[PDB]
């Protein structure tokens, strides 16, 4: 079981399913939400997150890591500090297609004082 670290940037406009190694430096495979949906309205949707998570899990099972540590974030500076629908739907599809999940953490950038 080779643990890869999946950054899921779930905003309200698009979701980013991103898979890196344990370092954070070397991106293995990323599929954004809007490259699976023709409509910019429905770019941030549970269907978009499901398609992105299925493609990412397929690539990472072709590479043979079959285990992820998932770090979920959102727009946190002056944003909302809550993930969009992409987080729940991508984690659901990601563990529904293989991918024994390891450690889940919501690493949102929380400002001590922004404005």
């Amino acid at each position: 079981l080779v643990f890869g670290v999946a950054r899921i940037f779930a905003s309200f406009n698009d979701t980013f399913v991103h898979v890196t190694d344990l370092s954070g430096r070397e991106t293995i495979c990323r599929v954004t939400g809007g490259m699976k949906v023709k409509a910019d309205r429905d770019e941030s949707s549970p269907y978009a997150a499901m398609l992105a998570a299925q493609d990412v899990a397929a690539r990472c099972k072709e590479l043979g890591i079959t285990a992820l540590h998932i770090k979920i974030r959102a727009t946190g500076g002056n944003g909302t500090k809550t993930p969009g629908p992409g987080a729940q739907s991508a984690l659901r599809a990601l563990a529904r297609s293989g991918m024994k999940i390891g450690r889940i953490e919501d690493v949102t950038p929380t400002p001590s004082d922004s404005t």
Partner: protein, 201 residues
């Protein structure tokens, strides 16, 4: 494209667990509203314990939990139960299309009496503007001290975010409710489906 299916069917290696801390006046209400919470979290597969000695709610993923987003649902649920949302609403976050949000509004007004006036202006006469916002945005809004805790669909989360910031920035919520009613009337007919609607507000 937007609907979400319930999870049909061990997806967890490290046994995840989350904790939140509550005070005593919430300890009473949580002690006599807890069996509803642990009943629904047992239906989702997550063990939920409450500690009146230290004052801590814990959730933890059991052996037979299958939904992996259930731990995020449970973490948000115990966050809202600590932040004194009532118990059926906190359990209503466990549906698929709901999400919560906390809006920090104390940073937006330098003054104090002006802040109290604008917060009560957000709350309205007899709560009528607040429940009008809840109707027009399909949300649950709770004006919680220095914060505002909202729940609902993500569209309603965005609209109540805009309305709460514009209420704190001295635009009136009755003006914003009139704006939202105009937007609802325009989105009713799809003959005007893609124009710039700024000529009406």
């Amino acid at each position: 494209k937007w609907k979400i299916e319930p999870f049909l069917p061990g997806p967890f290696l490290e046994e995840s667990s989350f904790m939140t801390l509550f005070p005593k006046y919430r300890e009473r209400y949580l002690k006599d509203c807890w069996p509803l919470v642990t009943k629904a979290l047992e239906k989702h597969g997550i063990a939920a314990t409450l500690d009146i000695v230290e004052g801590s709610m814990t959730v933890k993923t059991t052996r037979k939990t299958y939904d992996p987003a259930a731990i995020l649902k449970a973490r948000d649920l115990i966050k809202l139960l600590a932040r004194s949302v009532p118990a059926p609403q906190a359990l209503k976050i466990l549906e698929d299309g709901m999400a919560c949000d906390i809006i920090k509004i104390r940073s937006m007004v330098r003054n104090k009496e002006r802040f109290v006036k604008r917060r009560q202006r957000l709350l309205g006469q007899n709560g009528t503007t607040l429940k009008a916002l809840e109707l027009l945005t399909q949300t649950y809004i709770l004006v919680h001290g220095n914060t505002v805790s909202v729940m609902g669909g993500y569209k309603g989360l965005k609209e109540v975010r805009r309305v709460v910031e514009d209420t704190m920035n001295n635009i009136h919520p009755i003006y914003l409710i009139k704006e939202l009613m105009i937007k609802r009337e325009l989105a009713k007919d799809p003959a005007l489906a893609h124009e710039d609607w700024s000529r009406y507000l």
